[PDB]
Each structure stands twice: as structure tokens, then as C-alpha cells.
Structure 1
Amino acid sequence: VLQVLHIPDERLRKVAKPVEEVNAEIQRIVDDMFETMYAEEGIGLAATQVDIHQRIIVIDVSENRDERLVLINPELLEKSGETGIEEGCLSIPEQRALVPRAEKVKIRALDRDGKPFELEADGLLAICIQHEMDHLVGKLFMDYLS
């Protein structure tokens, strides 16, 4: 897997740079994320937690390596409802959170290859991403905790 960092860190709370086009190098990171994100204990990982300043995040909200999601430049479009999750991410320490996040969201991303999709999520996948995005821009979810 990858070299993920814990909090507080620099990458984790630093900002990333959005990209316009993708390739089979992002696919490459993305996988490295599944590989890791899985290995540890998260549903969704951002690529600001290994050590990168790009926008790549993955999701795994199913049970058996079934729903393996990817998001490269997922700008946010819609966000309906306001829910939280009684869960922890990765970087994160001993405590877990019930962070006030959004409930449902519709985004527009690029994928592993650089295929653009407008994806909508609900309740928790919705969270998975929301969360990872706070990371991509510099906040760990330790704002709504501390």
C-alpha cells in the first residue's frame, strides 16, 4: 500500500491542485488508493493523505470489493440534505466523529482514465466523498470535532 500520514500533518491539511485531463497514471494512483484505503479502515480515501496535491479519491461503500468508486476532479454541483456519519476516516486518531456533513450530493468528475461523469450519491457514499473533499482542500474533519 501507500505511505499515508496521520494528523496533524502538512499534506492532510494542505491544498491540492485540480487537473483538467487524466490518464492511466491517475488510474494508477486511484488503484494505489483502493489498495491502501482498503488495507486500512476507510470507505473513502483522498489522495492528499498519501502525499500528493492532486484530486484523486476513491470509495468502497459495498461489502465485497463490489462498489469500487473513483473521483478525480469531482467538483461539487448539488448537495441535498444535511447528514453526518458516526465514523472515522484514515489519517484520523483514536477518536471517531459524527461530523455534520451533507446528506446527498451530485458531482461532476473524471475517472481512472479521464472519463467525465456526473455522479450523485446519497446518505453515506455522499459522505464518503464530501469528507475526502474537505481533505483535498486543507481541512481534516477535525474542524467539526475541535
Structure 2
Amino acid sequence: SVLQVLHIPDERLRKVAKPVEEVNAEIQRIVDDMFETMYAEEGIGLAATQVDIHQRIIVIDVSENRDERLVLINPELLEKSGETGIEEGCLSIPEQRALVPRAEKVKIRALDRDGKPFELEADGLLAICIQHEMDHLVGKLFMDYLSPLKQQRIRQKVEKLDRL
């Protein structure tokens, strides 16, 4: 099922997600619905907060062929290094993109769709996406790294975009 993606301004996007208690069928259903939503909306990542589900669940696919499903349940950042940035977009801030400082490489641990723990060392676009999605789970949006003035313009453009 395709779920509705929250757009700013919406205080639900600023909520802190609680850790998933147990990866059961209900959690797997959320993960699958999130992937369906992410692909339908033509995105490379989606955090549960974005679909008004306040649990630490992220789905990602940064692959060219759109067939590399990554699931991060209760992710934890273990190590990071370097700095980089690209102009990021976000399904919750439609049609707006901006350069944000990110670590170049990150190493995380999380549970997969079967609830199995795994570790992943990421760099490039995947490291950036992981950081962006983890920020969503603690109610942080990429515009938060930008000056107050630029955030103002972003909100005005999104609000006017959702009026159409």
C-alpha cells in the first residue's frame, strides 16, 4: 500500500521516533508499504516519521536498477569520517534541494527486515542518504543545516507548491 508522505510545515515531522520493540509481521508490513511508497514517489530513501509512523524504521534504495533494498531498523551510528555534501532533496520538502554538510563515510549497525542484526560501512551517495534518513528519526530535516533565511524561502516555496 502507498502511504501518505507528510510535507512541511507539519509538526509530526519533528517527532522523535521510538525504537522498534520487535520485528514482527506488523513491522514487515510497514517496511513493505514504505518501499512501495518510496518507489511510487520516486525517492531513494524514506523514514517512518515521514509517513506518520514514529518508530525507528528506514527503507533505502540508491541503486541504478532500483533492486537493492536496504532496511535499517533501530540503526546506530558506529563510526564516521570525512566531510562531503551534495544538493539533497526530500519527499517531505517537495521540489526543493540544497547542499548540506555530511560525513563522507559512515559505519552503522541495524536490524534487517527479518530482525537480524547487521553492520554496513557506507560511502558516497549511500552514506549521505543514510545520514539524511537517520536525521528524520530524530525530527531533523535537511533544511535545518541552512540559514534561517533560506529555511523561510524553502517553507514559502513548499507551501505555495502544495496550494497548487
TM-score by length of 1: 0.93
**Secondary structure in 1 matching 2:145:** coil
Q: Structure 1: give runs of 5+ residues left out of the alignment.
A: none
Root mean square deviation of aligned Cα = 1.3
Q: Is 18-27 or 3-12 further displaced after alignment?
A: 18-27
SS in 2 for 1:130: helix
Q: Structure 2 matches for 1:1-146, cutoff 5 A? A: 1-146=2-147
Show CA shifts across 1:68-88 (max 9, x none): 111011111111221112220
1:103, 1:126 within 8 Å by CA — same for their partners in 2?
Answer: yes
Q: Residue 132 of structure 2 aligns to a residue in which SS?
A: helix
Q: Which stretches of structure 1, 4 residues or longer, exceed 2 Å deviation after superposition?
A: none
Gaps of 5+ in 2: 148-164
Q: Secondary structure at the match of 2:46?
A: strand
Partner Cα separation in structure 1 for residue 42 and residue 98 of structure 2:
14
C-alpha deviation, 1:54, in angstroms: 0.2
Give yes or no for contact 1:27–1:111 (8 Å, CA) kept in 2.
Answer: no
Q: Which has the higher strand share?
A: 2
C-alpha deviations, 1:74-111, integer Å up to 9, x for none? 11111122111222021013320111111111111001
Distance (Å, rounded) in 2 between the aligned partners of 1:136 and 1:49? 9
Higher relative contact order (CA 8 A, sep 6+): 1
How far did residue 19 of structure 1 move?
2.6
Superposed CA offset, 1:4-51 (max 9, x none): 110121221111111343122222111111101111132111000001
- Contact 1:55–1:72 (Cα < 8 Å) also in 2: yes
CA contact (8 A) 1:23 1:112 kept: no
Cα shift at 1:135: 0.8
Partner SS, residue 59 of structure 2: strand
Question: Contact 2:90 / 2:96 at 8 angstroms: preserved in 1?
Answer: no
In the TM superposition, what whole-angstrom CA distance separates every residue of 1:98-138 from its partner, at most 9, and x where no partner exists? Answer: 11111111111001121111111111101111001111001
Alpha carbons 1:24, 1:112 under 8 Å: kept: no
Q: Which is richer in helix?
A: 2
TM-score by length of 2: 0.83
